Coordinates of all heavy atoms in Angstrom, one line a residue:
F1 N 124.5 110.4 76.3 CA 125.2 111.7 76.6 C 125.2 111.9 78.1 O 126.0 112.7 78.7 CB 124.6 112.8 75.9 CG 123.1 113.0 76.1 CD1 122.6 113.9 77.1 CD2 122.2 112.2 75.5 CE1 121.3 114.1 77.3 CE2 120.8 112.4 75.7 CZ 120.4 113.3 76.6
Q2 N 124.3 111.3 78.9 CA 124.2 111.5 80.3 C 125.3 110.7 81.1 O 125.7 109.6 80.7 CB 122.8 111.0 80.8 CG 121.7 111.8 80.3 CD 120.4 111.1 80.3 OE1 120.4 109.9 80.6 NE2 119.3 111.8 80.0
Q3 N 125.9 111.4 82.1 CA 126.9 110.8 82.9 C 126.6 110.7 84.4 O 127.2 109.9 85.1 CB 128.2 111.5 82.8 CG 128.9 111.4 81.4 CD 128.5 112.4 80.4 OE1 127.9 113.5 80.8 NE2 128.7 112.2 79.2
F4 N 125.7 111.5 84.9 CA 125.4 111.5 86.4 C 123.9 111.4 86.6 O 123.1 111.4 85.6 CB 125.9 112.8 87.0 CG 127.3 113.0 87.0 CD1 127.9 114.0 86.2 CD2 128.2 112.2 87.8 CE1 129.3 114.2 86.1 CE2 129.6 112.4 87.7 CZ 130.1 113.4 86.9
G5 N 123.5 111.3 87.8 CA 122.1 111.4 88.2 C 121.9 112.1 89.5 O 122.6 111.9 90.4
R6 N 120.9 113.0 89.5 CA 120.7 113.8 90.7 C 119.4 113.5 91.5 O 119.2 114.1 92.5 CB 120.8 115.3 90.4 CG 122.2 115.8 90.2 CD 122.2 117.3 90.0 NE 123.5 117.8 89.6 CZ 124.5 118.2 90.4 NH1 124.3 118.1 91.7 NH2 125.6 118.6 89.9
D7 N 118.5 112.7 90.9 CA 117.2 112.4 91.6 C 116.4 113.6 91.7 O 116.3 114.4 90.8 CB 117.5 111.6 92.9 CG 116.3 110.8 93.4 OD1 115.3 110.8 92.7 OD2 116.4 110.2 94.5
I8 N 115.8 113.9 92.9 CA 115.0 115.1 93.1 C 115.7 116.3 93.7 O 115.6 117.4 93.2 CB 113.7 114.7 93.9 CG1 112.9 116.0 94.3 CG2 114.2 113.9 95.2 CD1 111.6 115.7 94.9
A9 N 116.6 116.0 94.7 CA 117.4 117.1 95.2 C 118.7 117.2 94.4 O 118.7 116.8 93.3 CB 117.8 116.8 96.7
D10 N 119.7 118.0 94.9 CA 120.9 118.2 94.2 C 121.9 117.1 94.4 O 123.0 117.2 93.7 CB 121.5 119.6 94.6 CG 121.8 119.6 96.1 OD1 121.5 118.6 96.8 OD2 122.4 120.6 96.5
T11 N 121.7 116.2 95.3 CA 122.7 115.2 95.6 C 122.8 114.1 94.5 O 121.7 113.7 93.9 CB 122.5 114.5 97.0 OG1 123.6 113.7 97.3 CG2 121.2 113.8 97.0
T12 N 124.0 113.6 94.2 CA 124.1 112.6 93.2 C 123.7 111.2 93.7 O 124.1 110.9 94.9 CB 125.6 112.5 92.7 OG1 126.5 112.3 93.8 CG2 126.0 113.8 92.1
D13 N 122.9 110.5 93.0 CA 122.5 109.2 93.4 C 122.9 108.1 92.4 O 122.8 106.9 92.7 CB 121.0 109.1 93.6 CG 120.2 109.1 92.3 OD1 120.6 109.8 91.4 OD2 119.2 108.4 92.3
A14 N 123.4 108.4 91.2 CA 123.9 107.4 90.3 C 125.1 108.0 89.6 O 125.3 109.2 89.6 CB 122.8 107.1 89.2
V15 N 125.9 107.1 89.0 CA 127.1 107.5 88.4 C 127.5 106.5 87.3 O 127.0 105.4 87.2 CB 128.3 107.7 89.4 CG1 128.8 106.3 89.9 CG2 129.4 108.6 88.9
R16 N 128.4 106.9 86.4 CA 128.9 106.1 85.3 C 130.4 105.8 85.5 O 131.2 106.8 85.6 CB 128.6 106.7 83.9 CG 128.8 105.7 82.8 CD 128.7 106.5 81.4 NE 127.3 106.9 81.1 CZ 126.5 106.1 80.4 NH1 126.8 104.9 80.0 NH2 125.3 106.6 80.1
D17 N 130.7 104.5 85.6 CA 132.2 104.2 85.8 C 132.9 104.6 84.6 O 132.6 104.1 83.5 CB 132.3 102.7 86.1 CG 133.6 102.3 86.8 OD1 134.4 103.2 87.1 OD2 133.7 101.1 87.1
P18 N 134.0 105.4 84.6 CA 134.7 105.8 83.4 C 135.2 104.6 82.6 O 134.8 104.5 81.4 CB 135.9 106.6 83.8 CG 136.0 106.3 85.3 CD 134.6 106.1 85.8
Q19 N 136.0 103.8 83.2 CA 136.6 102.6 82.4 C 135.6 101.6 81.8 O 135.8 101.2 80.7 CB 137.7 102.0 83.3 CG 138.7 103.0 83.9 CD 139.7 102.4 84.8 OE1 140.5 103.1 85.3 NE2 139.6 101.1 85.0
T20 N 134.6 101.2 82.6 CA 133.7 100.1 82.1 C 132.3 100.6 81.6 O 131.5 99.7 81.3 CB 133.7 99.0 83.1 OG1 132.9 97.9 82.6 CG2 133.1 99.4 84.4
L21 N 132.1 101.9 81.7 CA 130.8 102.5 81.2 C 129.6 101.8 81.9 O 128.7 101.4 81.1 CB 130.8 102.5 79.7 CG 131.6 103.5 79.0 CD1 131.7 104.8 79.7 CD2 133.0 102.9 78.7
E22 N 129.6 101.6 83.2 CA 128.5 101.0 83.9 C 127.8 102.0 84.8 O 128.5 102.9 85.3 CB 129.0 99.8 84.7 CG 129.3 98.5 84.0 CD 129.8 97.4 84.9 OE1 129.9 97.6 86.1 OE2 130.2 96.3 84.3
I23 N 126.5 101.8 85.0 CA 125.7 102.6 85.8 C 125.7 102.1 87.2 O 125.3 100.9 87.4 CB 124.3 102.8 85.3 CG1 124.4 103.4 83.8 CG2 123.5 103.7 86.2 CD1 124.2 102.4 82.7
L24 N 126.1 102.9 88.2 CA 126.1 102.5 89.6 C 125.2 103.3 90.5 O 125.3 104.6 90.4 CB 127.6 102.6 90.1 CG 128.6 101.8 89.3 CD1 130.0 102.3 89.7 CD2 128.5 100.3 89.5
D25 N 124.3 102.7 91.2 CA 123.5 103.4 92.2 C 124.3 103.6 93.5 O 125.1 102.7 94.0 CB 122.3 102.6 92.5 CG 121.1 103.0 91.7 OD1 121.1 104.2 91.1 OD2 120.1 102.3 91.6
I26 N 124.2 104.8 94.1 CA 124.9 105.1 95.3 C 123.9 105.3 96.5 O 122.9 106.0 96.3 CB 125.7 106.4 95.2 CG1 126.6 106.3 93.9 CG2 126.6 106.7 96.4 CD1 127.4 107.5 93.6
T27 N 124.1 104.6 97.6 CA 123.3 104.8 98.8 C 124.1 105.2 100.0 O 125.3 104.8 100.1 CB 122.6 103.4 99.1 OG1 123.5 102.4 99.1 CG2 121.5 103.1 98.0
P28 N 123.5 106.0 100.9 CA 124.3 106.4 102.1 C 124.5 105.3 103.1 O 123.7 104.3 103.1 CB 123.4 107.5 102.7 CG 122.0 107.1 102.2 CD 122.1 106.5 100.9
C29 N 125.5 105.4 103.8 CA 125.8 104.4 104.9 C 124.8 104.5 106.0 O 124.1 105.5 106.1 CB 127.2 104.5 105.4 SG 128.5 104.0 104.3
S30 N 124.7 103.4 106.8 CA 123.7 103.4 107.8 C 124.0 104.4 108.9 O 125.1 104.6 109.3 CB 123.6 102.0 108.4 OG 123.3 101.0 107.4
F31 N 122.9 105.0 109.4 CA 123.0 106.0 110.6 C 121.7 105.9 111.3 O 120.7 105.5 110.8 CB 123.4 107.4 110.1 CG 122.3 108.1 109.4 CD1 121.4 109.0 110.1 CD2 122.0 107.9 108.1 CE1 120.4 109.6 109.4 CE2 121.0 108.5 107.4 CZ 120.2 109.4 108.1
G32 N 121.8 106.4 112.6 CA 120.6 106.4 113.4 C 121.0 106.8 114.8 O 122.2 107.0 115.2
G33 N 120.0 107.1 115.7 CA 120.2 107.4 117.0 C 120.4 106.2 117.9 O 120.2 105.1 117.5
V34 N 120.9 106.4 119.1 CA 121.2 105.4 120.1 C 120.6 105.9 121.4 O 120.9 107.0 121.9 CB 122.7 105.1 120.3 CG1 122.9 104.2 121.4 CG2 123.2 104.5 119.0
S35 N 119.7 105.0 122.0 CA 119.0 105.4 123.3 C 119.3 104.4 124.3 O 119.5 103.2 124.0 CB 117.5 105.5 123.0 OG 117.3 106.7 122.3
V36 N 119.3 104.8 125.6 CA 119.6 103.9 126.7 C 118.3 103.9 127.6 O 117.8 104.9 128.0 CB 120.8 104.4 127.5 CG1 121.0 103.6 128.8 CG2 122.0 104.4 126.7
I37 N 117.9 102.7 127.9 CA 116.7 102.4 128.8 C 117.2 102.0 130.1 O 117.9 101.0 130.3 CB 115.8 101.3 128.2 CG1 115.2 101.7 126.9 CG2 114.7 101.0 129.2 CD1 115.9 101.3 125.7
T38 N 117.0 102.9 131.1 CA 117.4 102.6 132.5 C 116.2 102.5 133.5 O 115.3 103.3 133.3 CB 118.4 103.7 133.0 OG1 117.6 104.9 133.2 CG2 119.4 103.9 132.0
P39 N 116.2 101.6 134.4 CA 115.3 101.6 135.5 C 115.6 102.5 136.7 O 114.9 102.5 137.7 CB 115.3 100.2 136.0 CG 116.7 99.7 135.7 CD 117.1 100.4 134.5
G40 N 116.7 103.3 136.6 CA 117.1 104.2 137.7 C 118.3 103.6 138.4 O 118.3 102.4 138.7
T41 N 119.3 104.5 138.7 CA 120.5 104.0 139.4 C 120.2 103.5 140.8 O 120.9 102.6 141.3 CB 121.5 105.1 139.5 OG1 121.0 106.2 140.2 CG2 122.0 105.6 138.1

């Protein structure tokens, strides 16, 4: 009877493909900061 998955928070982390009834895990795309190391102009 289950169709979705919410893990601990409210965001969806799993889903069921309608046509093939398969369970798919969803992960966020990569992100991060960018820093510049300078010895001084």
